[PDB]
From a paper:
Presentation of antigenic peptides by major histocompatibility complex class II (MHC-II) proteins determines T helper cell reactivity. For MHC class II (MHC-II) molecules, which typically reside in late endosomal vesicles, the noncanonical HLA molecule HLA-DM (DM) acts as peptide exchange catalyst. Typically, DM encounters MHC-II in complex with a class II-associated invariant chain peptide (CLIP), the placeholder peptide derived from the invariant chain (CD74) that assists MHC-II proteins during folding. The MHC-II proteins HLA-DR, HLA-DQ and HLA-DP are heterodimers consisting of a highly polymorphic β-chain and an α-chain showing little (HLA-DQ and HLA-DP) or almost no (HLA-DR) polymorphism.
Here, we compare a set of MHC-II proteins consisting of the DRA1*01:01 chain and 12 different DRB1 allotypes in terms of their peptide exchange properties. Although these complexes cover a range of thermal stabilities between 64.1 °C (DRB1*07:01) and 87.3 °C (DRB1*01:02), they all show essentially the same three-dimensional fold. Thus, these CLIP-bound allotypes apparently occupy the stable ground-state structure with CLIP bound in the same canonical orientation and register. For all analyzed allotypes, CLIP was predicted to bind with its canonical core motif (MRMATPLLM).
Author numbering:
A (entry chain B): 2 to 193
B (entry chain A): 1 to 181
C (entry chain G): 5 to 19
Write the structure that this text describes.
């Protein structure tokens, strides 16, 4: 199918700061990916983003009850929906699972990548740190960053470049809002 | 200070495919979408529907307004069509692989438009549909789309996997490969 | 259960 395509998008956005103390509502209209007109609760009326949105901003702003309704959206729509969804979204907590393994089987004294795989957690904000004999490694850390799985869980893989030697204990430490104390998983340096 | 959370009700309508979508997004995850064929709310996790309800029928009136607005903008733009943006495709497991222990392949399709793809899972070159699932098109802040496809599987040294994605911005189907080691 | 509320898009001016 080579027929040209045309796409319309609308995004009704609620941005929440400090719980619901401060809320910003955005009513946004797009053609393909180009926003052409929007209502911003911080502005208080529709504004043309491109020249194609000028007829709609002028028309919608002339409808007084329509404008008052959109100006109240921070309460009737944003705050309401936050309240309804809070228990299973804002307050959703799922534990990370932490697995540690060397990327290759090597004798000691050879370079290697130690992998810290952190899986299944929610929410996304997380801190993963590498330690060698209790000392934090601030160098040689290679991270995928945060990976969204699409099913309300995340994963991240944090690797450490090192040369494992006899006696060393490497520790991956994870801090996460689901946890009351850091979760740690060790790999004691050993051949293969 | 930076925001703590964002809820987006995202809608689209696409011509000439006549495909519409209505969903809610929370911090990048789908709360629910409306099944346009069955006119019903589909919560992304079933438990959500034990805390909330949504009247699916009103979403269809929204999409009709979206369709009407699209036809206006199409004429207003002098029939300027969309530029195809091909997707990036990544295949990952959701958990560290253990041989002969169940796991899940995730096909992450990202940064594309228009929201139309054909996705097939291949095991040793044969299509697989047993237990597969997928999301609808998820909105991006740059107003492209994301999508996820899922394949439960039993890891083994003997099978290889591809996610095959067809998109009008690609010259050929894109295969993204996965195998143990 | 509580009900999630729907925002409505405005119909653009045609002609």
């Amino acid at each position: 199918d080579t027929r040209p395509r045309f796409l319309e998008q609308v995004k009704h956005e609620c941005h929440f700061f400090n719980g619901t103390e401060r809320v910003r509502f955005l009513d946004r209209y797009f053609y393909h990916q180009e926003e052409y007109v929007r209502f911003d609760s911080d502005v208080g009326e529709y504004r043309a983003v491109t020249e194609l949105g000028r007829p709609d901003a002028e028309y919608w702003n002339s409808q007084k009850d329509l404008l008052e309704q959109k100006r109240a959206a921070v309460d009737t729509y944003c705050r309401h929906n936050y309240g309804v969804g809070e228990s299973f979204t804002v307050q959703r907590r799922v534990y990370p699972e932490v697995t540690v393994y060397p990327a290759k089987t090597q004798p000691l004294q050879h370079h290697n990548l130690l992998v810290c795989s952190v899986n299944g957690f929610y929410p996304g904000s997380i801190e993963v740190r590498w330690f060698r004999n209790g000392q934090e490694e601030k160098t040689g850390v290679v991270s995928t960053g945060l990976i969204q799985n699409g099913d309300w869980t995340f994963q991240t893989l944090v690797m450490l470049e090192t040369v494992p030697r006899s006696g060393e204990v490497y520790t991956c430490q994870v801090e996460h809002p689901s946890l009351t104390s850091p979760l740690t998983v060790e790999w004691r340096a050993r051949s293969e | 200070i930076k925001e703590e959370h964002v809820i987006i009700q995202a809608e689209f309508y696409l011509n000439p495919d006549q495909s519409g979508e209505f969903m809610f997004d929370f911090d990048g995850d789908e709360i629910f979408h409306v099944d346009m064929a069955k006119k019903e709310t589909v919560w992304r996790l079933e438990e959500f529907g034990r805390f909330a309800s949504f009247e699916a029928q009103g979403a269809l009136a929204n999409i009709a307004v979206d369709k009407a607005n699209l036809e206006i903008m199409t004429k207003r733009s002098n029939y300027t069509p969309i530029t195809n943006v091909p997707p990036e495709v990544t295949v990952l497991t959701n958990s560290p692989v253990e041989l002969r222990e169940p796991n899940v392949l995730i096909c992450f399709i990202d940064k594309f438009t228009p929201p139309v793809v054909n996705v097939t899972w291949l095991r040793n070159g044969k299509p697989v549909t047993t237990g597969v699932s997928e999301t609808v098109f998820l909105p991006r802040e740059d107003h492209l789309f994301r999508k996820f496809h899922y394949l439960p599987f039993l890891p083994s040294t003997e099978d290889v996997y591809d996610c095959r994605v067809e998109h009008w911005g690609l010259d050929e189907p894109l295969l993204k490969h996965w195998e143990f080691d | 259960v509580s009900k999630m509320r729907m925002a409505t898009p405005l119909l653009m001016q045609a002609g």
